[PDB]
Symmetry: D3
Subunit: 233 residues, 6 copies
């Protein structure tokens, strides 16, 4: 039905969790969902629909980077009628305000990409999440006793930065971490009148300088997963 998703129209629930990693999506379906069905698998980018403790949710992989993320989110909204999108990914810490393990809620996503300038009159689009979703996250995290760190992230076109000298400046301006997709998710959701939010877990520390294995990036962040499932349930 679209070039990158081979689900039937109607296979997605209106609420969808997203990860860049399709194997994290697969792990979520197996560990937390019942009656789960793989609904799409083009380019190995898996998506699922199932029940979290009796309530329907969908999961979808979005690949790495703003261009990849934009592709999947565009199709989810425009073709698959998805209304609420919650990214739960990984990020690299740069700020003294946060530590490893920490879950960050991104109230803004700054970027070194040109995509928002192309979208938005070559001006500065402030890429932001839906407020209702951010409120629901905060309240749920409180209810569950999960100490959520709240601020900006910086969404980069680079995993391997050319601007490591600038991390302190970013931290000063309340950038808690760097990842590579939130500004894409936020701008696409704004374009298309949908509700989006990004949470991310600090697996890696860019200034100290720890890094999780590929396996730990799938398996270490059950608290963030539970937060997402609970807030969309």
């Amino acid at each position: 039905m679209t070039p990158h998703i081979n689900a039937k129209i109607g296979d997605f629930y209106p609420q969808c969790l997203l990860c860049g990693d399709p194997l994290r999506v697969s792990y979520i379906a197996k560990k937390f969902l019942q009656d789960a069905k793989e609904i799409t698998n083009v380019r190995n980018m898996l998506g699922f629909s199932g029940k979290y403790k009796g309530r329907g949710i969908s999961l979808m992989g979005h690949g790495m980077g703003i261009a990849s993320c934009t592709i999947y989110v565009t199709e989810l909204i425009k073709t698959y009628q998805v209304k609420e999108l919650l990214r739960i990914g990984t990020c690299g810490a740069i700020s003294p305000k946060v530590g490893l393990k920490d879950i960050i809620m991104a109230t803004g996503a700054s970027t070194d990409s040109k995509t928002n300038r192309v979208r938005f009159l070559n001006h500065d689009l402030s890429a932001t999440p839906d407020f209702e979703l951010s409120l629901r996250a905060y309240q749920t995290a409180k209810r569950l006793g999960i100490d959520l760190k709240v601020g900006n992230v910086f969404s980069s076109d680079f995993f391997y930065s050319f601007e490591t000298h600038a991390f302190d400046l970013m931290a000063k301006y309340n950038h808690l971490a760097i990842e590579m997709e939130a500004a894409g998710l936020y701008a696409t959701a704004m374009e298309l009148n949908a509700k989006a939010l990004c949470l991310c877990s600090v697996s890696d520390h860019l200034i100290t300088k720890e890094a999780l294995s590929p396996k730990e990036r799938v398996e270490s962040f059950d608290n963030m997963i539970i937060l997402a499932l609970e807030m969309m349930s």
Copy 2:
């Protein structure tokens, strides 16, 4: 002291309400504050300290445009130890999602200014308010029976726009109204680790050409003033 404020160190309370118009500031002190004292008046830009329901509150004018607002906000934080800054004003609505008398909570401020590019590595800074402050506005509005319109505003360097043809695109991307300062207030507060939020009253609709009568303008601004004072108690 500073070139633009003649208050004594210690004259400002840590929480301050801000408006563009120093006569709106004056109006607030004269009507709503107990023991209101004028604390500064350089360039006729007035500021006050007083009490509301037993709580110390300051008020400060910030003039028009990001550059003017930045001066005042920088001085308030760095010299006068202001920690929480709540800006209230009118705007020009550009979205069908809002109408006359609506109060907007600006969860992002986009801009055509170069100021955030200068501050932030020539990249896109997502200028955002403090989350706790925004949560405090939402909960207070709920208590007061105000239905907050939440979304982005666009902060322009132009009152008389050369890009009116772009207003529908702005509205498409969840910009509910146009004003001239919020992106500056937000960036400055991000730079300086202070808590900021902007609320805007819809007095004019730039698309529908709706405009409130001079009397209902006084009544609607009073409603927004009450919201703000209630938030700072």
Copy 3:
């Protein structure tokens, strides 16, 4: 009549002096003009008309920053038919060629604002004054024996710069001082086919760190004020 000026349509003389500070404007009206009338006071931004040595002249406050200055200058030209606009402001010296209280005529106003890029095809607009006003300032200063310094100024969106490391480069390219409005004045007068010039007196010296008090910024510049009045005769 306009949102920012409440003068009647023939209240301004075609020749108008401008200061960002409405209290310097008030000072000038009281000390130097006969039959001076306050003609506007919206947002506490004062303007006056009266006579100097028999000839009508107007005075108008323009606030701080290009965005503020543009609002006022646009309205003075379009609504009030002002033909000649002479800013007599303050600036921060960055060259040893000038000292505290020196008078500078800006033959060009460079800028870190995006406003002229937005106005002018995303190209470089060289913001410049009317040559005949500049000629008249030079000749009037020689006659009065006031030694006018002549060169570029840099019109910034920042009073508190993030680029102090660049001030030497700006001084190398013949920028004598930094102020915040000249580029906006010049571009607005260019757009609207009006005659403009900016003079500024040095109120801050960024080499020497000496800075005037707010009161001194009103009172210390009679030579600049007399120069301005004399060139309008």
Copy 4:
């Protein structure tokens, strides 16, 4: 070994073929490569090593967009010591000079990404392939009776473009087709002193809206796979 590749150093041969779709990578391994072995599978992004006409060749998936392709290419060169990278993909034709089923050698990759301005002093990096590899492709195509179409491609951050009105201009400047990775592959190989080339098969015509059937796409893709393997052996 890296966050995105779980192969051991020594697993990749120094020549590697790249495709965006890891299922395409799998197909090539299963049909064309002797002793095909899966060597990486992080995020479902498959990579393989095996032999073609006696020559060791590796295959690696790179995902969609410049940011994703940059991650994988950086790690293949800097960790896995890959020296020669040949990307083969589909593209959307924009030029009258090409049509469906044509194979394009990209001698330049233009872009709407900011990545190369970030890499390269905010100037214009002309992102180009290694000349000797491009010569090898030309000679191998002639030998195989492939009428190789040669020109620029335009590497976009957008699959769903906001600038379809510009496709004719891009075609005028010798952009034969649009894809989403070549500028990244080229700039990364330039940075890291590796040899890279991108070939792409026209699967869709973005002007006429004609498109190959799924069967027709696999058949045209096979010709390009043979070209790539033959030039690497």
Copy 5:
């Protein structure tokens, strides 16, 4: 001594006239100077020294475009000690206020070049002439009976514009004509603390679409030549 000038250090007088065309330079030496000596001829770019009414004056060709003009003016100031540089060039009028053969004094040179952004912090440099020279031109034109038209020029990288639709906008903002060098002459003299002015004679009218016809462009601009020689005398 330089790659572009084969004059000996000391061959140039400190006052030098400049044209893009070395054959205009030749014409001036032969018609207006006594004891003229050709002092440089690298790339056929002729320069001369001679006498006008007993005073030493030099002449130098500078080719077309900001980059060519910058080469020669940098060399003249830095190697050859030239102190005063007066360009007497040709331009294409975009204003109704000017006609064929009118002389324009450029009080500002706008540009579509990136050169000034490269030189000046990526901001807007207002490229302007030395005020004393401009005063000297104005007084000398007055004494001679020459009607000097005064305003900005637009210095383009394009003789054959891609933006002819924008000539009306350029004219609105007080650009009387388009040429290709003034912004570079002015920026280089500002860099290097030298005095520079640009005069240009209208050879082409781009609005009325009228032009001088080769014959004709030779003795056409004697008013400008003499004005220049008189101001250096």
Copy 6:
């Protein structure tokens, strides 16, 4: 017929060699062409037509910098029907891989000019030569026993750089040398559907500190001249 060329239509052969220096063009005409005729001479920018091994070839000066090169290339293609344009210029080496008098073939021309962003939607145009011409150069160089170095060049608006600290980064990205016209030649040829290529001989080595005299820049590069004539045969 054009303001910059006074040749008659049909005076140019369809294959043209180009140098910035019209005296190098003159040298080539006298030393290597039979029955050579000077065909144009406007602004001392010479051009010729003659025969090599009985085949017609033309030669044209293009001056210095992209704006100048663009003027002449535009006129040669549009008015004079020139189909194949071969720049044989000079350049400043920034890589250890090349020495004084080495011949570089530019497979891309990076730039600090704004010209290609003006041309190309504010995006990155990858400025590249015609492939068949580059193939011809390579094969012809083999035939002659000339060792042709191949890679990118950086086309600057500056001979005297403000970014000398960036040379090592340009070299890292496979820029062998800096010159000032190739990106303009390439973009113009791309715009007008013509075949172009740039070869340049090293006249300055910016790393080792060699620099040829003006005479050497005319006379030292017979190998490059012979290569160019033989490739047009």
